[PDB]
Structure 1
Amino acid sequence: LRFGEMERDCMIAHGAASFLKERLMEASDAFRVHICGICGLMTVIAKLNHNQFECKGCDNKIDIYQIHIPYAAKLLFQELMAMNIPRLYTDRSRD
């Protein structure tokens, strides 16, 4: 089925934020990745048979996180980089 903008809006108006998130992950994409904790990019090679998380270019084997994301958003970042553009910093750095 379709869950369009207006449906999203009136869900916002209810305020059932956890339902909205549930409908935007589990009913759909729900993809996992790993991001570089220094680049803020998604280039992390993750040999999951060996727990290895090298990030070439960054050249670290430590600062790695896994996040959860819509797959379409993953895609949108992929072609945004293909447009030569999006660091994804895992926490605050402004306060």
Structure 2
Amino acid sequence: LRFGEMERDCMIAHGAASFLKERLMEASDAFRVHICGICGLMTVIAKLNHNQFECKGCDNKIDIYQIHIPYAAKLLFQELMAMNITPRLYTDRSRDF
């Protein structure tokens, strides 16, 4: 069933962030993505059986992060990147590097 924009606004009015987050991600589409810690992109190749993590472009095998995001957000980022635009996800504590 459609949990539209009006419903989201009503839930924001009430002030219940946890219900919103659970409805949005855990109940519809949750996805786990490995991102590079230098270029902040989703180009990291991960072999989970051998836990081999590699970033080909930046020659990175250490700074690699796990992020929980929806699947439509991943699709949007890929479609943005297919037109020569770079949505570069960054982490809170990545300013040290």
* Count of aligned residue pairs for this structure pair: 95
Compute the TM-score of the two structures, normalised by the length of structure 2: 0.92
Matches within 5 A, 1:80-91: 80-85=80-85, 86-91=87-92
Q: After the TM superposition, list the runs of 4 or more consecutive aligned residues in structure 1 that deviate by more than 3 angstroms.
A: 92-95
Q: 1:48 to 1:78 in 2, by over 3 A?
A: same
* 2:22 partner SS: helix
Q: 1:52 to 1:94 in 2, by over 3 A?
A: closer
> Offset at 1:93?
6.5
Point out the structure with the larger strand share.
Answer: 2
Q: CA RMSD in A?
A: 1.6
> Offset at 1:47?
0.4
Q: Does the aligned pair in 1 maintain the 2:47–2:53 contact within 8 Å? A: yes
In structure 2, list runs of 5 or more residues that go unmatched.
Answer: none
Q: 1:15 to 1:94 in 2, by over 3 A?
A: farther
Percent sequence identity is 100
